Amino acid sequence: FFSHWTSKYKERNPTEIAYSEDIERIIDSLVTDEITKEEIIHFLFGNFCFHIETMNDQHIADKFKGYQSSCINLKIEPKVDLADLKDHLIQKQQIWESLYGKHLEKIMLRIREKKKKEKEIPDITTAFNQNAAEYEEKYPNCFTNDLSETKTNFSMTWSPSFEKIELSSEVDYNNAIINKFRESFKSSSRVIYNSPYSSINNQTNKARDITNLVRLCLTELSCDTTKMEKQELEDEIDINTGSIKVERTKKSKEWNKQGSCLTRNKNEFCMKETGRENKTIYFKGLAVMNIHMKKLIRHDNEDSLSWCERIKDSLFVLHNGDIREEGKITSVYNNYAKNPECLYIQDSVLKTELETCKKINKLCNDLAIYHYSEDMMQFSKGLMVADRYMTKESFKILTTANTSMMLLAFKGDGMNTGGSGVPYIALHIVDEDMSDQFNICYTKEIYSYFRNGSNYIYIMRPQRLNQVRLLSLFKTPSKVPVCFAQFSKKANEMEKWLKNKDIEKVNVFSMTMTVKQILINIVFSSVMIGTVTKLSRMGIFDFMRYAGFLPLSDYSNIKEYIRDKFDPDITNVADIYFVNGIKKLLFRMEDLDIIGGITDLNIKCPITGSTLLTLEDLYNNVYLAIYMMPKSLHNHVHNLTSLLNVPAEWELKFRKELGFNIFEDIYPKKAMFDDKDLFSINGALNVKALSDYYLGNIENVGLMRSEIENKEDFLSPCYKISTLKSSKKCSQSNIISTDEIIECLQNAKIQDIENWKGNNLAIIKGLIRTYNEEKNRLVEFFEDNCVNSLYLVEKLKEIINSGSITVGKSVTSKFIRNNHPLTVETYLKTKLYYRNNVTVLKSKKVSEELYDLVKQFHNMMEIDLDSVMNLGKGTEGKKHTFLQMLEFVMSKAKNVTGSVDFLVSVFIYLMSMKVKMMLYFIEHTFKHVAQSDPSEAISISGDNKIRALSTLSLDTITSYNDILNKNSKKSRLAFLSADQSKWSASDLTYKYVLAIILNPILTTGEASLMIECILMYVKLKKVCIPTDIFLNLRKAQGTFGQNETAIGLLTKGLTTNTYPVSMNWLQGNLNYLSSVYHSCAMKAYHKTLECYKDCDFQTRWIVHSDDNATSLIASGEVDKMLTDFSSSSLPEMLFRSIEAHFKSFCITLNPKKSYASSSEVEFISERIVNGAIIPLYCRHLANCCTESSHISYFDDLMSLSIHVTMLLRKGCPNEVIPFAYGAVQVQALSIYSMLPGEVNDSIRIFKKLGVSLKSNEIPTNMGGWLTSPIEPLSILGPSSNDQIIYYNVIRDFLNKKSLEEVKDSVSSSSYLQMRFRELKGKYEKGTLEEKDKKMIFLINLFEKASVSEDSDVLTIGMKFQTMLTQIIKLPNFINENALNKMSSYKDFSKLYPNLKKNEDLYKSTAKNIASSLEMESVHDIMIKNPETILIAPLNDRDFLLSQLFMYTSPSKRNQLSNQSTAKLALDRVLRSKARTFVDISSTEKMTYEENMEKKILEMLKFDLDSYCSFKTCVNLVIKDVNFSMLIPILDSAYPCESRKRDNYNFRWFQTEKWIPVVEGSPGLVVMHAVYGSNYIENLGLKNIPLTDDSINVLTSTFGTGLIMEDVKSLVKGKDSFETEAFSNSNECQRLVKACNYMIAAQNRLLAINTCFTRKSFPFYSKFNLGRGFISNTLALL
Ligand SMILES: NC(=O)c1ncn([C@@H]2O[C@H](COP(=O)(O)OP(=O)(O)OP(=O)(O)O)[C@@H](O)[C@H]2O)n1
Ligand SMILES: NC(=O)c1ncn([C@@H]2O[C@H](COP(=O)(O)OP(=O)(O)OP(=O)(O)O)[C@@H](O)[C@H]2O)n1
């Protein structure tokens, strides 16, 4: 172990760091009445003398010099010798050790003072009544007993039953329904208005208006079109971004002319030229939709439960008469659920489970679950399509696969600025038989009805829906059938009735009344849960995650949670059913193998099905009801204001508590270190606790320092660090300069009104738009910022008085949204000098910021080629380290920079590059400290062992309780599952300095650097609100009474943007240091509890930042000490004592999610009771239906199959797995890669062109369907589907039986050439069988759509986790708009000027006069330095021009252009049906399906010279270690009943193929297990040679393309070119594979040693660092 001091800061002490008086205040504030200042200093600087056994002697001299300097600067006489300090610190030990007993007495007094003040509620009903009483006390008379003023019961949209077959013959089936309703709505006027909820005083007077509006819109304002063209969209260039989807200017944006009406497309109509009485009727109907006063019903309303107990069974009657049999959602769900035998390889033993799944599918078919979900999905489609394009004088009649359903959509909030939603009136035709049940069910929203024929025509009430609510309505086919399947499985009456009957006898007719009632509840709950669009239902359902703990003890959650902080916001009826289910569960728990519920007689909360055989069924039902709700139905505008509003309040609370005023700095005070309640710690106890923690954790200072400076990439340049190189995002305050602003104002003349070209017109527009209403501040900015005062304003006078200028109005958000960003910059900056300063932080990549930092380190600001190339080559040139750049940044910004670097923004938080580097240093010097702690969970690599540590924390605790309580005394268990509240907001930050001073694995210079870093992070941090949000609050504050909650007080009345956030580190920034402090606090808790005299306590705790998993086992005289601690049992003891102890460590325990029990613990989401773990597969099942990224079909299908895989891991039953398959299929296919029957299908396209591939053999990237079985998807993952179909077509191609025959036939090198020649001859003369055409198709697909194709991992870093990739990559930007606003492009465009800057066509013309010379120079200084463009930067001049030589490849600007951005819905369902661009430069615009047709027609021919990709695709499949041993196990596995499996329910999968396959690869003994598998299954050991040699072939071709063209067999000389010409013999890839298969050189790298050999043939082996890298078979563990 060698020691290296990594600082120029060596001669700096922690008491001379500019912000050094705060350390003096911390020292002065730690002085107690028993410990003086001298002992505090001697302990704090000198604690390292307990660690002096593993550190160097130069480290000894360094730390003793730091000790002496600290004592001299603090006016204390230091000890002369190190042994003198050791003797003094070992003799003043009992003074410091006595703090634990006083702390024990303090927490006992705090429990005694806290339990006396609280009040006790007698029962749960009194808690509910007290909540209702205080709710009436806030707002009086808010509770109404009349059910006529409430909100809508049955949510956004209503689905009647569809009773008549509608024949179509030349009548356009979508349009025949509209004229059917029109001819129904032409009879007389027997309009009966509906009184809601059987009321008597019906006002009406609006039902007449709605009826007249609907009659007008269906009689006069619309007609049978049947001839107009469909809506077609086209991509267009935006003035701020690229490639947005919009309607074309002609055709589908123009109003056509039918007979006396105006029409746009097949659905939209208009009334621009209509009679005045008709216009009056239209406006009278429009005024209804608007184009305390809360009536909340009580929890104990017996009328609402009685009404719901008729509404929810009228719904079941309505869900029982539908006659439709085929559809889109029905087809995809019946692909998996109607025949689930294909998913399971050994399906012959699942004769009961698969039959139950088939019965659940038949019940879904007969109750019209699929058809209702499909109707909701397409109506949400049509509704948001209507939301963006509708005007006030137009409507958008929607029709679907329905028979008796329409919707009359009206003007919504196009160009979304929050808004309210899109109005819509739905019409229904119901027959005479189901007429009373329709009135009973939808009694609130039926607005008028009349009778025509044997039918009733219903007009329902208009509502409105935001885009988020339409998106939650969209995922109905993914959310409702899985709800029906899970609730039908977990209900024991439903499953019990399903098990006796047969598939031909399952119907509603042969049902008992109890099973029918359970089915009614299941249908109603699935409908109400799968589509949720109300905030009250979300409040009710996330109230449910705390009122659901049965096996419990004292938690302060049964009664004190249902008091004041519970919000009973029940607005409608029939959520009384859900709240009443909660109330019955709580009343049951009040009156009091896991068998938890066969004896308690528990009741399901949403589905009410009794006789619960297992507690895990209850946990699964509640948590699936919880996790299926959306994250938020609020807009991003409201959510961002909430996220920017919480820290302002939690900082104003801190300032008010500790006496700081609003506009001043933050310094330590005595109150923070005096053991107070709100914002304080104990002080001297914290120092002793941290010293004891560092004594007990760090065992070798030098070895751990070596691991820190070797594994965290210290003493290495910053581009080797993945956090500071991989472009996440960043924040750099780029503001147009004020001198540049006044210069642009000066050069903007008044004689060039026509010639206002360039970007200066944007500055002119911004200053004029600011002048139009903000005259008060523009004169101040024009007279104080610039030295010329009157000239600028007098020039602006005739600038506005020039007559012609393009400004409409200060429309605020309408100006911001669709104008150039520098217009926003100027419209800000001309009124921001002394107030409202903003200083807008625009986002940037960290790679560009690191590029600028490396450029600024070597003083190469102005870019010059000789200046960068003079830095040397190889591993002997100029190179920096991470800490040298860190101190360069610190020395730069300590020089009066204005503290612009400490500015974060919300985009979860967006910090600067400096703050990212300081947080990296502080984070990763404590990551290894937390890695040495066995009780620390955030240091666990991944989520794999997170469950494992909880398993140990249960197992050793239970084993020790079994080993102690049987001998001498009694023991009581106490498991704590705490979660702290405001872990970052309420936390004192200055206590982290004490964790750094006492750190022994450090240096007195590095410690000073970290202390100064944390002190500037506290004293100078600020938060900048974004421009649109701050303008919204500014205009709201101007219109209103000018008061705000906390943001107005912090920003001096909203007159400035940056508000101070000092003692609140942002969440995720200190995630290891806070966890270290938490574990230190728990060790101090154990040391404090060890001070009790006649009792023995041992504590086991587990810490992951915010969370806690404390266990405690007491022994001895328990009965006396329990009333000493003021409690009744050990969980009550633990919940009181830990809460009292944590207040001395600035940790706030909240009595909401923190419970204490004697048998149950929870950690994050996993949960283990009495040595057995409850599975909780709810999160993955909900992620299978709700969470998606919305980027592509391939990406989202591969991402959702992760959740399917973890569903298979965590014990899912075998009847929800086919529904999980169907759910991920609907969620992947329902946006862009369209559903069966639509335009972007892949079964239909492959069937039309006669492709030889079958339905279940289409690859995933071809738009095909996930058809991998249960076992290979569970073991390998989503990347196994294409591997399985490739292996199947290969095994059919060479006509073999097993994989081993294929392996020993491929292993001969003279075999695949003969097969390829035989295939070529077969294609030649006369014969091509089906297998040959399949093999040819997949060979050409591997050529055209391999994952390595058109990708390099050094421009954008990818991971290569699959075999193939997306074959259409839509460009997010067109031309060089993606490459702009970049320092790399601005440098590349300067030393290589506009001959090669603008544009891609100018560079492409240099491949067939000055651009050819520039390209020749580029590739001449590129090909002489080969290591700079296709490996990682070895040093500088391998990084600064590595970012410069990537803007020359056509496939490296395309890769940066089509980067996957976030976007949202309606930007991808519209782009899929639009004529999109192909690449970065093409005049041709073509659709997605036509592109797919062209690509499939391209990959149909044999295309000889395809031998290399044939051998590559064979060898990528067969050579996998995991696949080649998983397949023979699956092929030769015994069914059951010998050692594999003998149980039935949820015990085939976890007994037959996840334990005899885990005795397969690593060998194992355990029988039943929930699996956290190994790392990712590697299919990228062979693909990173493909990328790293494809880029070599590309630069070879682009180097050889200038001087000459040639074909082959080149004779030129100049060895680096002749050897690459010999390298390009066939493709260079078969040469790569064969040549480095038959030898293995493996020469080391020094870039002169390796360039000594040859530039081409053995050099490429040192551009991947490995060859034929075969991994080991992964242990599932
Ligand atoms: N992005 C939008 O279009 C939108 N959505 C809701 N809002 C807020 O609510 C009002 C109604 O929106 P509009 O801009 O369509 O109404 P308008 O201003 O009276 O009509 P117009 O566009 O023809 O001038 C608007 O005045 C505005 O305050 N704006
Ligand atoms: N009630 C609690 O016991 C609790 N648990 C966490 N927190 C801290 O609260 C900050 C923001 O709260 P959020 O609105 O994001 O939800 P949350 O974290 O789940 O807390 P809560 O249950 O109170 O809503 C978050 O920064 C979070 O750390 N409070």
Side-chain angles (χ1 to χ4, degrees), residues 841-858:
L841 327 165
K842 57 179 45 58
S843 272
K844 257 167 54 85
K845 314 168 62 171
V846 295
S847 309
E848 297 289 320
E849 268 266 41
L850 185 51
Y851 173 78
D852 274 272
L853 271 182
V854 174
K855 246 168 51 60
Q856 212 168 338
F857 199 24
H858 306 268

Side-chain angles (χ1 to χ4, degrees), residues 376-393:
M376 302 275 88
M377 158 197 107
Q378 322 204 50
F379 273 135
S380 56
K381 259 185 195 197
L383 269 174
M384 46 205 181
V385 167
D387 191 36
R388 204 183 275 208
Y389 303 127
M390 266 312 107
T391 86
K392 176 195 208 154
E393 314 98 319

Side-chain angles (χ1 to χ4, degrees), residues 673 680-683 685-687 689-690 693-694 926 929-930 933 936 983 987-996 998 1065 1070-1084 1101 1103 1105 1141-1142 1144-1147:
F673 303 84
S680 290
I681 37 69
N682 204 171
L685 182 85
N686 273 207
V687 162
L690 281 162
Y693 184 63
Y694 286 146
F926 272 94
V929 188
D933 203 13
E936 170 73 52
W983 179 253
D987 216 308
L988 193 86
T989 304
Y990 278 141
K991 57 173 213 175
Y992 296 137
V993 189
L994 303 191
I996 282 157
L998 297 160
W1065 48 277
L1070 286 186
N1071 248 29
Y1072 274 94
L1073 216 170
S1074 37
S1075 325
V1076 155
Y1077 215 107
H1078 196 179
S1079 189
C1080 155
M1082 293 288 326
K1083 222 198 61 57
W1101 63 94
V1103 160
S1105 207
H1141 158 79
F1142 273 170
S1144 275
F1145 284 80
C1146 211
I1147 300 180

Side-chain angles (χ1 to χ4, degrees), residues 123 196 347 978 1079:
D123 41 7
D347 59 272
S1079 189

Side-chain angles (χ1 to χ4, degrees), residues 648-677 679-819:
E649 307 188 48
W650 261 111
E651 204 257 355
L652 216 178
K653 273 196 57 55
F654 149 80
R655 296 185 98 99
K656 145 162 182 63
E657 220 288 324
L658 287 186
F660 300 102
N661 68 82
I662 274 298
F663 37 68
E664 83 152 38
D665 81 346
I666 290 303
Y667 56 93
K669 279 160 120 310
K670 188 47 159 54
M672 333 185 158
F673 303 84
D674 213 339
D675 215 343
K676 254 55 216 173
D677 267 276
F679 293 87
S680 290
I681 37 69
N682 204 171
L685 182 85
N686 273 207
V687 162
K688 184 92 230 302
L690 281 162
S691 154
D692 280 26
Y693 184 63
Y694 286 146
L695 249 67
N697 249 23
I698 291 134
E699 319 268 14
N700 203 306
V701 164
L703 200 186
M704 172 145 278
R705 201 190 157 86
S706 170
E707 300 185 334
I708 280 174
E709 309 203 334
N710 185 270
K711 210 145 307 301
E712 289 328 288
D713 266 319
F714 296 117
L715 311 183
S716 155
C718 311
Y719 30 85
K720 287 216 39 153
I721 286 137
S722 49
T723 316
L724 311 163
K725 182 57 193 295
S726 288
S727 50
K728 285 301 291 139
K729 285 315 291 183
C730 209
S731 82
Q732 178 254 350
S733 100
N734 241 341
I735 272 286
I736 298 165
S737 149
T738 50
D739 204 0
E740 211 273 290
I741 278 283
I742 66 108
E743 158 255 309
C744 176
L745 183 56
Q746 275 218 36
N747 51 62
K749 248 67 74 167
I750 43 183
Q751 273 70 54
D752 42 29
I753 317 277
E754 180 255 314
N755 256 353
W756 276 331
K757 260 28 156 178
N759 321 303
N760 301 40
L761 182 68
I763 295 92
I764 289 304
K765 278 169 188 217
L767 49 90
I768 283 315
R769 213 144 183 160
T770 322
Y771 156 76
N772 288 325
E773 81 286 339
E774 279 285 284
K775 192 74 177 167
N776 36 28
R777 273 297 329 281
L778 111 96
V779 197
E780 192 264 355
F781 177 71
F782 273 26
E783 94 192 50
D784 200 15
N785 165 255
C786 170
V787 291
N788 205 353
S789 151
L790 254 298
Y791 189 43
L792 303 185
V793 273
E794 77 90 28
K795 176 171 228 197
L796 189 139
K797 194 51 160 46
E798 84 281 8
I799 274 290
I800 183 57
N801 290 340
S802 56
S804 60
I805 197 165
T806 36
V807 277
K809 201 253 202 202
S810 147
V811 277
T812 70
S813 88
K814 330 189 175 199
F815 171 58
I816 298 317
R817 273 171 77 81
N818 31 315
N819 261 271

Side-chain angles (χ1 to χ4, degrees), residues 1603-1648:
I1603 48 193
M1604 65 189 183
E1605 164 256 354
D1606 214 283
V1607 172
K1608 278 305 293 321
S1609 316
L1610 187 88
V1611 264
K1612 195 62 71 73
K1614 63 174 221 203
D1615 210 303
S1616 149
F1617 240 88
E1618 194 135 53
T1619 40
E1620 93 188 300
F1622 279 154
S1623 188
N1624 214 315
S1625 54
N1626 47 306
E1627 189 48 65
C1628 198
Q1629 267 81 316
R1630 197 43 55 197
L1631 152 70
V1632 154
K1633 196 45 202 66
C1635 185
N1636 247 2
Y1637 150 75
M1638 61 90 78
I1639 66 83
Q1642 272 333 286
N1643 189 337
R1644 274 291 71 191
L1645 174 287
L1646 164 156
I1648 316 297

Side-chain angles (χ1 to χ4, degrees), residues 994-1041:
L994 303 191
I996 282 157
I997 296 188
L998 297 160
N999 212 338
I1001 85 186
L1002 254 196
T1003 296
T1004 200
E1006 317 182 44
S1008 100
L1009 195 76
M1010 261 195 268
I1011 288 158
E1012 144 166 317
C1013 276
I1014 263 190
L1015 273 158
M1016 281 196 308
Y1017 184 71
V1018 168
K1019 217 174 203 245
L1020 292 173
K1021 212 210 310 152
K1022 268 144 137 60
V1023 173
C1024 159
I1025 328 166
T1027 302
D1028 44 293
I1029 299 171
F1030 183 47
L1031 267 197
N1032 283 358
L1033 302 116
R1034 182 149 196 77
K1035 66 151 289 318
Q1037 173 254 350
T1039 59
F1040 274 11

